[PDB]
Design a protein around this ligand. Structure first.
Ligand SMILES: O=C1NC(=O)c2ccc(Br)cc2/C1=C/Nc1ccc(CN2CCCC2)cc1
Length: 303
C-alpha cells in the first residue's frame, strides 16, 4: 500500500524487491536491524553483489520512516571510493529497504579491538597499515568537505572495514550542508559524544571542516590504541572541561612518533591552525599503496 517510501525517494533509485535476498543479521542500525544479502542487478557490470540491507518495518512511526528516507537521500549523492555507497532503495512493498555496500569486516572500532592479542588473519597494524587507514579516512573526509558537508561525527565506530581491509566513512546521520556559510551552529540539544568533539564545538556548538579535523586526530589515537576509550579516567563531564580548556590526549604507549605529531596538528586549539584533510593526505601520499591514485578523491579531477 501507500506510504512514505512512495513519496520521499525518487523512483529512479528504486530496485525490485525480488532482486533482493536476505541472509543474516549484521547488527542494529539507527532505524532497525541491518542484514546481509545478495542483490541481483544493482551494480555496474556485476550480475550479483553482496550487500548490506537496512530495514524499516511497517510497524515504525511515519516520522522515523521519513527520517530513514531523508537520511538515504543525503547519502545518494556521495560517490567516493572511501565512502560507503548507497546502491538503491526498495520502496514498493514492506518493509522499506535501503541497499548499502557490504563491508565484510564491520565497523572500524570493533575491528581494531579484534586485533588485540587477548584469528590467524588479524594482527596489530604496522605503521604502514596505519598510514593507509589514515589516508583512506582522510580522503573520504576531503571528499565530504569538498562537497561542502561537515560530518560532525567522525570516529572509528562510524567507519567500516572492507574485505580487502580498505577503510571507508560509513555513517552520515549527523552530516550538515555548509554551502554558503562554512559552519553549522547547533541550536539546542545535541547527541554527539563529548570525547570526539572539538573545543570550539564544546564551547559554542560550532562545526566546521576544522572540527572534523579535530575528530580525525581522535580516530588516529584510536588506531594507535586499538580503540581504547579516549580520556579514560575522566568522566564525560570532566572531558568537557579538560578539552574546552586546552587539554589533550597523551601520546599512546609505543605510538609511532609520526602519528602523534599528526594528532598534535589536528588538536591545535585555534581551529585555523589545523591542517586540512588535503594537507594531511599530501603529507603521507608517497606512503600510500599504489592503488590509491586510481581510486581516491585526492587524485581525481573533482579535486
Ligand atoms: O556492511 C555494512 N554496510 C553498511 O552500510 C552498514 C550500515 C549500518 C550498519 Br548498523 C551496518 C552496516 C554494514 C555492516 N557490516 C558488517 C559486516 C560483518 C559484521 C560481523 N563480523 C563480526 C566480526 C567481524 C565482522 C558486522 C557488520
Amino acid at each position: 500500500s501507500f506510504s512514505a517510501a512512495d513519496v520521499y525517494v525518487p523512483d529512479e533509485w528504486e530496485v525490485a524487491r525480488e532482486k533482493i535476498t536476505m541472509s543474516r543479521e549484521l547488527g542494529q542500525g539507527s532505524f532497525g536491524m541491518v542484514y546481509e544479502g545478495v542483490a541481483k542487478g544493482v551494480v555496474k557490470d556485476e550480475p550479483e553483489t553482496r550487500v548490506a540491507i537496512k530495514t524499516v518495518n511497517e510497524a515504525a512511526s511515519m516520522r522515523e520512516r521519513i527520517e530513514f528516507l531523508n537520511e538515504a537521500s543525503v547519502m545518494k549523492e556521495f560517490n567516493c571510493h572511501h565512502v560507503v555507497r548507497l546502491l538503491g532503495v526498495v520502496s514498493q512493498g514492506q518493509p522499506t529497504l535501503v541497499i548499502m555496500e557490504l563491508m565484510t569486516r564491520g565497523d572500524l572500532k570493533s575491528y581494531l579491538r579484534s586485533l588485540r592479542p587477548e584469528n590467524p588473519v588479524l594482527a596489530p597494524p604496522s605503521l604502514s597499515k596505519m598510514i593507509q587507514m589514515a589516508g583512506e579516512i582522510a580522503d573520504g573526509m576531503a571528499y565530504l568537505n569538498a562537497n561542502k558537508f561537515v560530518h560532525r561525527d567522525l570516529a572509528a565506530r562510524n567507519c567500516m572495514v572492507a574485505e580487502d581491509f580498505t577503510v571507508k566513512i560509513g555513517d552520515f546521520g549527523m552530516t550538515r550542508d555548509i554551502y554558503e556559510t562554512d559552519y553549522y551552529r547547533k541550536g539546542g540539544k545535541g547527541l554527539l559524544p563529548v570525547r570526539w568533539m572539538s573545543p570550539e564545538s564544546l564551547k559554542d556548538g560550532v562545526f566546521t571542516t576544522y572540527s572534523d579535523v579535530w575528530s580525525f586526530g581522535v580516530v588516529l589515537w584510536e588506531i594507535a590504541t586499538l580503540a581504547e576509550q579516549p580520556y579514560q579516567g575522566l568522566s564525560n563531564e570532566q572531558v568537557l572541561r579538560f578539552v574546552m580548556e586546552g587539554g589533550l590526549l597523551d601520546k599512546p604507549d609505543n605510538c609511532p612518533d609520526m602519528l602523534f605529531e599528526l594528532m598534535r596538528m589536528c588538536w591545535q586549539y585555534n581551529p585555523k591552525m589545523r591542517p586540512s584533510f588535503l594537507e594531511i593526505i599530501s603529507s603521507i601520499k608517497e606512503e600510500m599503496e599504489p592503488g590509491f591514485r586510481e581510486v581516491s578523491f585526492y587524485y581525481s579531477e573533482e579535486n
